Amino acid sequence: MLFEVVKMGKSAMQSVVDDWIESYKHDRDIALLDLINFFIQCSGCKGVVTAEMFRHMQNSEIIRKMTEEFDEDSGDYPLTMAGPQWKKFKSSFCEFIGVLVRQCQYSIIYDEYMMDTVISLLTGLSDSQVRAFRHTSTLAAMKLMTALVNVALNLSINMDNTQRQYEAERNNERLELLLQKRKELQENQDEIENMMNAIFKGVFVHRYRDAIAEIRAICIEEIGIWMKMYSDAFLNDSYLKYVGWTMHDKQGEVRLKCLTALQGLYYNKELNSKLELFTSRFKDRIVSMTLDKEYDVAVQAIKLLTLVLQSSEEVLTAEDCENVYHLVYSAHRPVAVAAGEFLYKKLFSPNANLVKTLVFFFLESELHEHAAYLVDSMWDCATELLKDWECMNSLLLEELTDRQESALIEIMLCTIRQAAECHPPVGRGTRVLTAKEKKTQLDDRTKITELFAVALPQLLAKYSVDAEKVTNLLQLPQYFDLEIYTTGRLEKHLDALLRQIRNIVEKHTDTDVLEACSKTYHALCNEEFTIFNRVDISRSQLIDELADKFNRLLEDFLQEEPDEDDAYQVLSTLKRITAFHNAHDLSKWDLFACNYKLLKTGIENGDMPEQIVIHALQCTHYVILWQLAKISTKEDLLRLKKQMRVFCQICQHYLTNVNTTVKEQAFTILCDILMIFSHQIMSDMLEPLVYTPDSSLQSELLSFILDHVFIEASKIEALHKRRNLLAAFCKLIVYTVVEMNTAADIFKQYMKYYNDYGDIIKETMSKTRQIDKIQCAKTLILSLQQLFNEMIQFDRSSSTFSGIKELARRFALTFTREAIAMLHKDGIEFAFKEPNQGEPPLNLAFLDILSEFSSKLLRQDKRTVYVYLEKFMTFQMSLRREDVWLPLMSYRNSLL
């Protein structure tokens, strides 16, 4: 019943122990037998030990007998089963052992009967090969020993007090009593040190290195507990060494326990010279664990190193701390933050010099060239410093090396962004934000706005010459509340801003700088804030200036043969325009005329700087899209299509342009427009607008993909471009802007280009499956067919051939069976498509490929398929078995 009482969780444990102690005093033997059974039954064993067995059998033959009548139906046992019922049982089980010992520690423990019995059994069971015994008894034994360490401790305290009493009486009969007592206590300690030595040498020594990792963890956990609870007796080399070794255990959970154990010997209490010699032996292995394969482990390794730092800063070297600092840039936020708190204590333990400290750190970092991840790592522990924008601002303005200025601008940007939008950077996320956190948000945004509405104009003024710096500063207004521009009486500063922006726009040619300007001017032109009109007026006036410099430049440019300087002029102004047309309406300037004349003049002569072509192509794309936004006349509607259809022609011409980045520019714009004017437009009738590519254009687009996407430093950048192009084409496929047959040339590349393109191809397959269960499976075969014909440049089952068959297996895994019917159908038609001389028909080997797809049939359909096969194969085809005919045999057995 004991097992049951602890299982049910019905009652508190001290009452269960006390009832057991009652009975132990009444009748020892019954109570000890009930206790034995408890430990056995906690292991899931259904057997029972009888009074007869108890009196007569030894533990060896009891355990054997209880392995026999274990009566298990699975391989489960209570300490492994999951759910709360059992998580509770485990803790109840360990409470019962701890409380039982402590209650007995003044009397019963020191009889020869109870403890000896229990220890000898647990030692026995912990030796069993039956895992449920070995595991349960080891847990029990570990808890039992922890309980003895506590008794041991109280004992030494009682000794000290008695000893002090004894010495005080050095001046009768009381003295002989104290001498007696002193002696009895000493006997008691020796007795306890025995039981401890029994358990430790009979159980721990073996079980900490158990084959099962859960068991090794159990052991290392308690040894940590012992050294923390009674450090004077256990915190020394002779016990720490087990933890030192197990730090090299091949299992994460076990390594994690080693680290938890050690942390317990620093927090909250210091300081031990024993512990610090140990820590010095194993320092190298500990810092190495900051890159443990398991990240949960690496967090605790850093946290331990942080604790080490306190007690003493000299155990760790320069290089050690440097290896930990690297982890601020980690992919995983927990190690990142943990390393961040390490960094904080090491180098940041009014604000100005700390802000300068962060700058120096970031600049000596050769792993990241932006601050978003460093800032996020520090977000929890240096939140006071990181949100001190007024300090950071003053350092950039009021009287410092330009590299540091650059860096500080960056960090400022990041702190601002992380406070504005209230989430970590990409890869650091996990919220749906709490009450207090969006209070802080609103606070932060206001402080940012109020400070930087005023400050930003002076910041731009000072740094406008520097491209990188400006791009950074220009991100700022996107982050602040704009009501505060009027209610805050700040409109004069806004005008200063728009002036600084416009001077930048005009003197800069860098794409990113201009992109920044445009995107910001778009944030400010929000017509739900009263400021819209003021800023709209300056937009209107800025673009008024841009277009007019463009026209004048275009007059002299297009007749006098212009040289590299005339081009750089055009180009620059065109870039300024294109950037802004992307974000902003600009319809009021019929800009198509200038770009079309620039594009069509481009094709005729063939010597037009790539960059001028590229941005023109972009610009026109934006002109056309912007008209399509505001659709309200019905001649505006047909004028649009005049421009649209002609632009698709120009794009198609530039798609064969000798220049590769021009090809790609044209292609992407093309793929965009085709998607935009794909007659999925309808949601209202814009039926005239629809564009469908002639088969001429479709083949043009596929040639591009095969030449430029499929063909085998920083080449990851080149891969990004390529995937982008691929997905641009696959969107045309899966929204049926193009015939699914084109996907054949793409599906065959799935295994050959699996890492570059695998997932884009896989998504393309599935998105085609939901669109048409069968013609997807038809195109899957045409793919395998195309691979087969390619191989034909008729004689080996080779590496190539094995390739197509492997791919065939992967296609088969997707396939209800009306499609697979159609698949086997077309595969058979292609197998017997061409005849031989001295007959097997050409293409017969394709049945060996097709045989990959026959698993996913049903015998009903298999014979339907067979009936379709017999319309091709003849009686003496069915009889000429070998050689060169095995594809036909194997495909036939595949069905039968």
Binding site: T67, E72, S74, G75, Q129, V130, R131, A132, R134, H206, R209, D210, A211, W245, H248, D249, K250, R255, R285, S288, L291, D292, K293, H326, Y329, A331, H332, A336, L367, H368, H370, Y373, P425, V426, G427, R428, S518, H522, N582, A583, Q618, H621, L625, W626, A629, F667, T668, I669, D672, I676, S678, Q680, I681, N724, A727, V734, D759, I760, E763, K767
Partner: protein
Amino acid sequence: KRKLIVDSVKELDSKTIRAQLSDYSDIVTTLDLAPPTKKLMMWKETGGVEKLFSLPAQPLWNNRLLKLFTRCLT
């Protein structure tokens, strides 16, 4: 045959624990970096098959123009 789990071997031997100390290279690793530049940090945001199939090949900064594209996505 019993579903009762029984372990043929119960301890790692002393020698293998010696080895475990001598070589921990298989349980340690190389530093996994977050995106090291703004460019790569943006790629990681607007990267993935899902974002790729739902956004234009030539990016569109204004939502007014962006919906013209996303409109046409069944």
